[PDB]
């Protein structure tokens, strides 16, 4: 014979609990990647982005190593 249902209350805050939030952790990860890719794409034109980030990527990085010949540069 059972006298009482068997349960506990999990910690919660603002209607969130750890079981639920843990399911969404991967999703935040992917959104972070999306935001990262997007942000980087938006500043791909910025010379510093090319110099410090994009030109350092192996193989692909030579896409962003471009020199104007001294003969063609007024400045």
Ligand X SMILES: CCCCCCCCCCCCCC(=O)OC[C@H](COP(=O)([O-])O)OC(=O)CCCCCCCCCCCCC
Footprint of ligand X (CB under 6 A): 16, 20-21, 24, 31, 34-35
Q: Residue 66, interface with another protein (CB under 8 A)? A: no
Which region among 23-31, 42-50, 54-62, 67-75 touches another protein (by CB under 8 A)? 67-75
Q: Residue 73, interface with another protein (CB under 8 A)? A: yes
* Look-up of token digits 């939030």: 21
Of 20 and 51, CB closest to ligand X: 20
Q: In sequence order, what are the beta bridge partners of 13?
A: 16
**32 contacts 24 by C-beta, under 8 angstroms:** no
First to last CA, the chain: 91
């Amino acid at each position: 014979y059972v006298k009482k249902p068997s349960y506990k209350i999990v910690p919660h805050f603002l209607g969130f609990n750890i079981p639920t939030v843990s399911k969404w952790i991967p999703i935040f990860g992917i959104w972070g990647a999306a935001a990262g890719i997007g942000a980087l794409f938006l500043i791909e034109g910025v010379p510093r982005t090319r110099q410090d980030i994009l030109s350092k990527i192996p193989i692909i990085g030579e896409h962003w190593i471009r020199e104007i010949p001294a003969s063609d540069n007024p400045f």
